[PDB]
Design a protein around this nucleic acid. Structure first.
Ligand SMILES: [Mg+2]
Ligand SMILES: [Mg+2]
Ligand SMILES: [Mg+2]
Ligand SMILES: [Mg+2]
Ligand SMILES: [Mg+2]
Ligand SMILES: [Mg+2]
Ligand SMILES: [Mg+2]
Ligand SMILES: [Mg+2]
Ligand SMILES: [Mg+2]
Ligand SMILES: [Mg+2]
Ligand SMILES: [Mg+2]
Ligand SMILES: [Mg+2]
Ligand SMILES: [Mg+2]
Ligand SMILES: [Mg+2]
Ligand SMILES: [Zn+2]
Ligand SMILES: [Zn+2]
Lengths: 162, 38, 108, 155, 43, 177
RNA sequence: CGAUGUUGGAUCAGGACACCCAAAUGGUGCAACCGCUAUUAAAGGUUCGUUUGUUCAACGAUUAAAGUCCUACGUGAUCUGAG
């Protein structure tokens, strides 16, 4: 991995690019002929929002996702992983992947509401005051439709709207 | 801002951004091109 | 050893099939609570009303405990003590009192 | 090997005993139950039996009411042939779906051959002037289960 | 608040009651039975 | 088994106190099992007319979790009766005002709609945190399992498990995060 | 149809928002004052008089404004009977 360091001395600035050792891929993938990382490690339709050990492999230290041209994923797997990362960040998983602000960490606010499988942004949803009757019912989306193809051991389809 | 059902860019400087759950045509050169998806 | 259900709660199930195959037998001896899974009985004995001058008066003080309350607060106390609602303790009229069976049937 | 949430099934993995050891253990258990029966160490037996279209869980000195008349006189003894289940404080024998006549024997004495209380059956139709009233008096029989015996012929 | 004009099931505007997976499975089972029947009625 | 009639009756129909930790648990999944215990549908001696019903003590009520955006989408509507007195409060606002309210309403809704609902609701004790009076604490018998398995956050993971999990891809050395 | 008593007005108003005023903003062929549109918001207000039975309508004087409707064209076991 590459880092940029800045040095200031006597109104003179020097920026340097330092390369440190980075982890490499594990020696034995179960499906070596796959052209895609997830699809060759046999994790397709196998991860969820709570699999942080996989979701944190490729995200920036401040929580941002990594570009597809760098990660190597196929488009659908990239979208699924991006949605899973968003859901984990909203649920509260990955607590060390946030920027550090000492000035803003002191003014504590109201306690965070526990949540999980959150599809939309918490600040963009309006409360459903009407809620409809049985024939026209306003359903609350839960989870994401991108993960509707995950393996279901019980056989019951996931309730994405409830 | 004009609230519309279909958003279209009226120049080359209009950019489409998703905010507050809606889609927006924001324009800086021509502020009259501000459109909000209903 | 094998058992479909744990053998920790009150019986030890051992299933088997007869050689003919037409009968399923099962031996389920009861299980006693081990001595290490119990606690000693707590003893509550305190006589704080005893007096060194008059034991008869000491006994009278401990035996003459009385209290009276109105229907409202009394029913509230009963409901709080038995974890019920106040509506259970209110009486009923003659029409409902006289229609109760004087000699209800008894089984066993 | 990756360990994700959906990579493994969400139930404990079950391993079953080898068939020959299972058969040997079954033989041992059957022998122990048979020796208990032969020694007669069981205190009291209950039995689930099939009689007159219903299944009854009866013990000794028991009373049952059957909603139909039987072709016997009062005070006659009757062997209940269909016994589905037998049980005691220690062991329990199940049928597939029935037990053996030589294995279990249940006797019941006929007590009373009577008729039931008058049951009302009324059909009524709104604003159609259709009312129909009927009285049902179903014959009934009372059986006293006396004894439940089990034999050591359990292979 | 969400009234259904007229009766629920007869008018031009009816109740939008949907089709369930149980209903689909029942219809599929009936179709399989009828296919077997029309096979047996062939020769 | 050879009990006398009265002690056998007392043992059979005795009331039991159950504990339930509500930390990071869905209020609906808490309320379903709490209502089952309150009604007594877990007893083979259960009957509608009998008063068979056990006490349920739910702790960590303030730390419940709603799946999805229910915190901002689910609303609770009340009416004071007076004209213009219809209030619709968001789930988050109701939780901030009263932590007990969300699970209390869930259990009240899941309970049967007869007159016994109030009586068996009087047997439900809800505590915002793990601060239970000793009188209630000494009555507890067993703690029911939490209906939802709470996932562990990344820093809670063991280093052994972190290194055991494979690296599915090899980032380039020249890339800068 | 073995009766669901009508317009208008008086008294009291409940509600909706498709907001007239009051509040926060976007665009203007928005220089400022006046304006024209659109977004969000319904806790509170929304006049007194001449003619007409009038709802409407014209006119006079003002107001921050003198909103559109639903309520058995709200309300006659509360009132009037001008039509
Ligand atoms: Mg209708
Ligand atoms: Mg219709
Ligand atoms: Mg008429
Ligand atoms: Mg009449
Ligand atoms: Mg009003
Ligand atoms: Mg509006
Ligand atoms: Mg204004
Ligand atoms: Mg108003
Ligand atoms: Mg009209
Ligand atoms: Mg009227
Ligand atoms: Mg009236
Ligand atoms: Mg009138
Ligand atoms: Mg009058
Ligand atoms: Mg006249
Ligand atoms: Zn792929
Ligand atoms: Zn533009």
């Amino acid at each position: 991995f590459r880092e940029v360091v800045e040095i200031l001395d006597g109104k003179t600035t020097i920026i340097e690019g330092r390369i440190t050792e980075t982890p490499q891929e594990s020696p034995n993938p179960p499906n070596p002929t796959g052209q895609c990382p997830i699809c060759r490690w046999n994790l397709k339709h196998k991860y969820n929002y709570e699999d942080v050990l996989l979701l944190s492999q490729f995200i920036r230290p401040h929580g941002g996702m990594l570009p597809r041209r760098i990660t190597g994923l196929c488009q659908e797997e990239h979208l699924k992983i991006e949605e899973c990362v968003k859901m984990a960040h909203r649920a509260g998983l990955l607590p060390n992947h946030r920027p550090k602000l000492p000035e803003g960490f002191v003014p504590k606010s109201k306690p965070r509401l526990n949540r999980y499988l959150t599809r939309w942004s918490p600040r963009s949803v309006k409360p459903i005051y009407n809620k409809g009757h049985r024939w026209n019912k306003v359903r609350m989306p839960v989870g994401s439709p991108l993960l509707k193809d995950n393996v279901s051991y019980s056989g019951r389809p996931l309730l994405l709207y409830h | 801002f004009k609230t519309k059902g279909v958003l279209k860019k009226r120049c080359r400087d209009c950019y489409l951004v998703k905010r507050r759950g809606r889609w927006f045509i924001y324009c800086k050169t021509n502020p009259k091109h501000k459109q909000r998806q209903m | 050893t094998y058992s479909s259900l744990p053998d920790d709660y009150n019986c030890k199930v051992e299933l088997a099939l007869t050689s003919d195959g037409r009968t399923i037998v099962c031996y389920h001896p009861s299980v006693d609570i081990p001595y290490e899974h119990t606690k000693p009985i707590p003893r509550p004995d305190p006589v704080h009303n005893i007096e060194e001058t008059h034991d008869l008066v000491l006994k009278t003080r401990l035996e003459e405990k009385g209290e009276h309350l109105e229907q409202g607060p009394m029913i509230e106390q009963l409901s709080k003590m038995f974890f019920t609602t106040k509506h259970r303790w209110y009486p009923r009229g003659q029409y409902h009192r006289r229609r109760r069976k004087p000699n209800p049937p008894k089984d066993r | 090997v990756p360990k994700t949430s959906l990579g493994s099934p969400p139930w404990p993995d079950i391993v079953l005993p080898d068939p020959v050891e299972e058969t040997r253990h079954h033989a041992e258990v059957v022998g122990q139950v048979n020796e208990l029966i032969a020694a007669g160490r069981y205190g009291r037996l209950f039995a689930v039996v099939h009689f007159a279209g219903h299944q009854w869980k009866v013990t000794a000195e028991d009373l049952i009411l059957i909603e139909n008349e039987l072709d016997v006189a009062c005070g006659e003894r009757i062997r209940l042939e269909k016994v589905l289940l037998v049980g005691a404080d220690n062991f329990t024998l199940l049928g597939k779906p029935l037990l053996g006549k030589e294995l279990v024997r249940v006797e019941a004495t006929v007590i009373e051959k009577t008729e039931s209380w008058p049951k009302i059956n009324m059909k009524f139709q709104k604003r159609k002037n259709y009312q129909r009233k009927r009285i049902t008096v179903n014959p009934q029989t009372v059986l006293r289960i006396n004894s439940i015996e089990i034999a050591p012929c359990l292979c | 608040r969400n009234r259904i004009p007229g009766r629920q099931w007869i008018g031009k505007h009816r109740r939008p009651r949907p089709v369930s997976a149980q209903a689909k499975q029942n219809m599929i089972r009936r179709l399989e039975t009828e296919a077997e029947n029309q096979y047996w009625l062939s020769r | 088994s050879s009990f006398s009639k009265a002690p056998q009756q007392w043992a059979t129909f005795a009331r039991v106190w159950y504990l339930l930790d509500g930390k990071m648990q869905p209020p609906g999944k808490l309320a379903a099992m709490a209502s089952v215990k309150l009604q007594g549908l877990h007893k083979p001696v259960y009957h509608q007319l009998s008063d068979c019903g056990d006490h349920v003590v739910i702790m960590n009520t303030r730390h419940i979790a709603f799946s999805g955006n229910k915190w901002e989408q689910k609303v609770y509507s009340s009416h004071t009766g007076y004209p213009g007195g219809f209030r619709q409060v968001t789930a988050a606002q109701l939780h901030q005002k009263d932590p007990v309210a969300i699970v209390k309403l869930a259990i009240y809704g899941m309970l049967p709609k007869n007159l016994h609902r109030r009586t068996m609701m009087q047997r439900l004790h809800l505590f915002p945190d793990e601060d239970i009076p000793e009188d209630i604490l000494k009555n507890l018998v067993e703690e029911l399992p939490q209906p939802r398995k709470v996932p562990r956050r990344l820093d809670e993971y063991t280093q052994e498990e972190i290194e055991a999990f494979p690296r599915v891809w090899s980032p380039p050395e020249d890339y800068r995060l």
